Amino acid sequence: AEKDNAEIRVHTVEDYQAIVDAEWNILYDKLEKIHHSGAKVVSSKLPIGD
Amino acid sequence: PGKEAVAMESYAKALRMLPTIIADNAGYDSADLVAQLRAAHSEGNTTAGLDMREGTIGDMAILGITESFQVKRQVLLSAAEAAEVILRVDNIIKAAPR
Amino acid sequence: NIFKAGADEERAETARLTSFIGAIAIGDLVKSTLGPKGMDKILLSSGRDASLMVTNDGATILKNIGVDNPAAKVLVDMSRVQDDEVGDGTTSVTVLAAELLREAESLIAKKIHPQTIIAGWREATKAAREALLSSAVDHGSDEVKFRQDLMNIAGTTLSSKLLTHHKDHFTKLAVEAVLRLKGSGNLEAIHIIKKLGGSLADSYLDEGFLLDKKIGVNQPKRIENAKILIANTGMDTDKIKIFGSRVRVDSTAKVAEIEHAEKEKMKEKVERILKHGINCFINRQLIYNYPEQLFGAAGVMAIEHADFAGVERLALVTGGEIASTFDHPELVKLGSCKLIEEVMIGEDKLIHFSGVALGEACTIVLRGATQQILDEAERSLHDALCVLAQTVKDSRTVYGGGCSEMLMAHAVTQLANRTPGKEAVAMESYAKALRMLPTIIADNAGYDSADLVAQLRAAHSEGNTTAGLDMREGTIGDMAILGITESFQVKRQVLLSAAEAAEVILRVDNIIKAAPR
Amino acid sequence: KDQDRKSRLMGLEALKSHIMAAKAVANTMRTSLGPNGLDKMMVDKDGDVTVTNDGATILSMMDVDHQIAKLMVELSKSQDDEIGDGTTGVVVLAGALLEEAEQLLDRGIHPIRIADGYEQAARVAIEHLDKISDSVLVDIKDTEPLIQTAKTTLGSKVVNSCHRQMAEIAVNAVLTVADMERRDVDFELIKVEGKVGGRLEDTKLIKGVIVDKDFSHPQMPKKVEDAKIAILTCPFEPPKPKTKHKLDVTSVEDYKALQKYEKEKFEEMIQQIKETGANLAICQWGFDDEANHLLLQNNLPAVRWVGGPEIELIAIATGGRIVPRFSELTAEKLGFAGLVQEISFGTTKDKMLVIEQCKNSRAVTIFIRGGNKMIIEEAKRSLHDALCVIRNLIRDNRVVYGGGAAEISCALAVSQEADKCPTLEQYAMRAFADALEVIPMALSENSGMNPIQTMTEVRARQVKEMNPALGIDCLHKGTNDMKQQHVIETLIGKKQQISLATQMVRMILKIDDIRKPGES
Amino acid sequence: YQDRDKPAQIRFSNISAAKAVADAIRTSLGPKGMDKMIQDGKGDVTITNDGATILKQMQVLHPAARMLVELSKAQDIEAGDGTTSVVIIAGSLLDSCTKLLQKGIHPTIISESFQKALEKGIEILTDMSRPVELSDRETLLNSATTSLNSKVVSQYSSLLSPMSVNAVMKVIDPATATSVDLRDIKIVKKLGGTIDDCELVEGLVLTQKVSNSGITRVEKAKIGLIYAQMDRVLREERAYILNLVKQIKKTGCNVLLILALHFLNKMKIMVIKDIEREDIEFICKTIIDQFTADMLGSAELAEEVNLNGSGKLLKITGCASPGKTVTIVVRGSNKLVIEEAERSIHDALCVIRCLVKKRALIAGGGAPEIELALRLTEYSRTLSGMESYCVRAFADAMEVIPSTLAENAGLNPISTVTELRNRHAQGEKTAGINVRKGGISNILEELVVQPLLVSVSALTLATETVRSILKIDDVVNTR
Amino acid sequence: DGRGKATISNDGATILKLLDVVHPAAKTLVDIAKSQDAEVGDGTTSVTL
Predict the structure, then answer these.
(1) Residues spanned by the domain of D249
(2) First CA to last CA across chain D, in angstroms?
(3) Which chains lie within 8 Å of chain C at 3 or more CB pairs, if any?
(4) Nearest to C65, CA basis, from C46, C87, C88
(5) Other beta carbons less than 10 A from residue C257's beta carbon
(6) D517 touches chain F (CB under 8 A)
(7) Structural domains counted in chain D
(8) Residues D277, D356 within the same domain
């Protein structure tokens, strides 16, 4: 997305697996907070990825 | 030969201008009618001509349209001699009116 | 306020004139260069006085000049395709396409619809094309007559060029180069060498595919059964085509380490080359002296400083392969050459092959005082090799010098006898444009055009299909006796390309120009 | 604010100025109407040059500042979803209704009253089209007559040489993605691509998604019969970022240490393909020389450097999903297809990826070969309206004979219905009749014939000779009665030409003012 | 007629722009020609009668007129004499073509007609010339002395003439080689001394000093053309310099053509640096990884001879290499003394070079032009067609040279060329205009002659320029 | 407006908002239309005319 991204520059190869997961973690957290409240219908103004 | 070839084509082109003006005064299309006559008289069909009544091309012998030979021979010669005098004169000398 | 601020659209009346005036101006520019007597022209760029030059070539003029008219841009693009593909008739396409548009403009003033004019030119094109097919005369047998026709075509292509004076010696060079080919019309097999010194009559020829380039410092002058292998990589030093990478050197011993690392890297490369089991090696990059001694110790001839044209030509002449990667051994095809000898022509070391696989190739060595003479000598010679190679594929030949152009105009006139009303006038203007080519040729020669062209009409009217214009004596004679002829594929290509170029201009009644950025 | 230097146009002169601005667009496109219509020269802002007679393409390339002229352009977006062919005929018809409306404004008739006359006469013309319409595929679904109709539409383009072969492809493409009984055909499920080289006769129908990309290695298997597709956004190798890796190797100690860690990642992800049962691996990036070395031993072909939008098109057609990382791999996310091949073009190194379903599917892509990019681009538009012609026949198979026979037959009925309206709208009904005569009149003018003598001659034939409508031959064929010439346009298209043209005229007449501030 | 399209407008623009240049320089022809005043853009004012100098200061922007400027430069390269005469002849030819184009004659007919008159014109000047022997040094001395008398320095011409003759006869085999390279003879001029002191050196003599290198002599030389760490770098800089010297030492090169001053002195290598590329070409024909022994020259004894008036010069003799080269040393009081001394040598070498390629002598004072115009008139009567008037226009255009010399001599230009024409009809080419006595006199007794190559190259180069201008249809400005 | 987009409608309340006339007496009638919306919500065209 144009709004929320994750960019971290490290020289460690093992940290690349975490950064790619951390960028997906922020998205997974935003999806979990909706499930945490138990909201069945989600109406978003901005587009939602596949 | 070469130089006399262009002068004859302009002479033959002027003869095609007579049926062209006749078609224009009748409100028809002169481009089609004159071109079809040139293609008709090119191979056979020496009697083909213009029909002003029906607005098409038909046989002149059947439609009963003909003209005298002495008239056409005189118009042909008098027109060539008249254009020969004007073409030959390159200068005009005018005097004082009396 | 329909189109403002850079956006301009010419209406049906103005886009009509703009389309022809822009196209006719291009045809009227290069029309003075048609024929062997054609005028010269001066080209000078604005702001730079070093662009001064004089050339009568119609193709060179159209390339350097700019065109701001999209209608005239189509005509220019069709001229460059004529020069790049066939090589001959670049001026003929531009002049003939312009005369069709000049006569088409006068027909529009008569209220003849453009679609009707197009329908007339399509029928006249087929009638004019069948006229050349009926008059085309080839030779299956009698190679002497076939070789003589090649000399007449070569002497005709070299006309109105810088080599036109010495062309008599050059006809023997161009024909022999194509005669020895005897096969596919690939022109990469015939190499061209440009050397300074000597006059134009001193140009030599070699049938063993002589190379324009020199190799190494001390090389063997003779080798038996040399296997040709081409490779592409730097053979000189490290950091080939690598920018931004540096090396830290704290003392002289660090430079000696680089010299040892260079010899270590070159040694590994020489080993992989020797694993192919080759007696000769070719690469585009220069070869350093240390791997050159490693090649000379094993008998491998080191060839360096090859260009892009070399790899393509050295592969087909010797029967080899590009083989950019020599890493994996014996996975590539190797060339076949009987002997590689050193020949010195023009105070320069040159490479001469012998007995190569498909050895029908050859090389022509030009001789000139400066480079500008050699460049124009190659362009005039290369254009001749294109039509001669096409003559081998199709041996049909027709008579030039106004003979073929006037014959096609006669067949269109007879077609105007049987035709509907409006198509009669349209095909007549098409026949008049074909008679403009022999008319312009007479004007550039100072001879009377109205006298010579009009006699050709009466000549081809009753018999005499071989009559034409004679520039030497300024009269009309047989084109077969005088030895003036051109290929059949050239006439068919110029006739069709000029008809398709003028057809596009008529189909455009409006020009929409957007706002420039 | 900014009241000064504000352009204002009001009064009766405002309507005559709007009509004049609208006639400038109609008089421009009326010369390109029909198969013999003259072309137009297009000069792009970047210097490109293209030549096309397509009306929808012209309106997109025309830059007009006037507001009413911009409304004429917005109509093309609505009609292209239906007809896509006679879009020019609507602009010409819209210009004829406004041109005849100028004579009525001099008599003192109110503009709204004029717009009511066109709406009243439009329903009469639409009703007359239903009576004279004939069917084809009614009650029987057959592909034999459907192919012959598409052969005529392609005759007006540059594809008229290969026109016969491209007709059977568009028929099998629409019937594959949707059933004629469903009467629902989506244009998003149909894609059209092309590449320079070859001829227009080489056009083929491949069922699936096709994009031009090569395999990760040339020795990979060229034919995969079973359906297994792994679509990931990352290549199979040690994880690398989206831009630059930049590995830090200090000395040989770090080289041998990291190489063993990379060696463990080499065999892990390559053997992971067989764990999920996948065969073909579609990755967004390429593979190293060691990664392709392990694929040759295990016989696992793959595609490298897949584009961003190409990933979404492959997952939808093959029925797969986008997999961000190999940790989420499963059997459900694998894509399906009948065959996967690599087909090159001549000596070119393109080697477009070919995904074949070996059966019917819900999406197809037509590929076009040709020697010129501009001809292929016009060949793409040649199939665009061709799909609409087939789609209209699926929705309603009733058709009306074209070539001007439809517009002339309608004005005969509208002129008779005019005397039945004792009111000022009678003049608008008479002007609506002469406006319908313009479309068949522009066809004869573009053919190099006398427009008026051709129009009045057809009128006498439909009234006297025979009741069925007779058309005008713009191709210089044998004679009239295009029914034998097989020139036919769908009935849905005829109803939209009158409906959309009535909307534009009604909106232009009811706008009496245009305001806008100037530069201060 | 009509003539809607008028391409001849550019033809008349090319003739008008070309004639304006020839009309200017015309008054500067001959020893009696009027001087001209050229003012530089900076305000500097100079006065010179030389035509080759004025043409360079004109700043000609017109394309066709620049061809005449380049035509004068091509004349100085080959013959080296008659620069002004070529521009005047080319100007009268284009002026005669104006009357021909108004009659309707096509340029290609005019261009091809001048070529036949040019081939005939060469035979006329050749048959009337005087064959001379190249091996004879008495004729070479007299032909050069009388020619340099009309030049700036007439007093010292007797001294510089044998220096040029002995130089050419040394580098060129008499009566054998038909080609002479003027770059094979180098002239060195220095301040001090006098022109009476001259030295012809069989080797090479340069202007450079061997400073600061103190070797100054090398016999049998092979010449060729090519805080602790702070002190350690100074030792490493000496290592890199000596490294490239070691490779030179292995080949045996004792003289190099260009801290290192001391390393070259340890190897006994003479330092020659700051050398011009044109000066290298003189050394090129006479005698680091790519540096080898095969590209080295040879020498016998190298050294620097410092005299009072010749300054510091490098005298290297006994090159022992295939070729023929010499060197001339020139001395003089001031800079203008040695300047005109060298300029008189170039004029002397060009006249001798013309005699080597073509051995002949013809009279001066407008004699070759009148005899040429006399025979071409009778030759035009035998021709048929358009070539009749074209040759007569080419013949009548040759009258501008004698009429100009008579005008600068104060006589009547019209009466002079008329009387001389009948003198060449009854007599020979010996008749002509004598500018020293101011009247018609026999030029053979006046000892005024010029080599044949000057007149032949004047007609050959000017005709090719006139034909090139007539063939131009138009000019196109590209970008 | 200055952006280039065109607003098309017969609503009297919307047109008066986009005019923004600088004449002082003209601003008075414009302000009365605004008070007409709060009290009723229509009839701004009738009150102004």
Answers:
(1) 208-361
(2) 11
(3) B, D, E
(4) C46
(5) 14
(6) yes
(7) 3
(8) yes
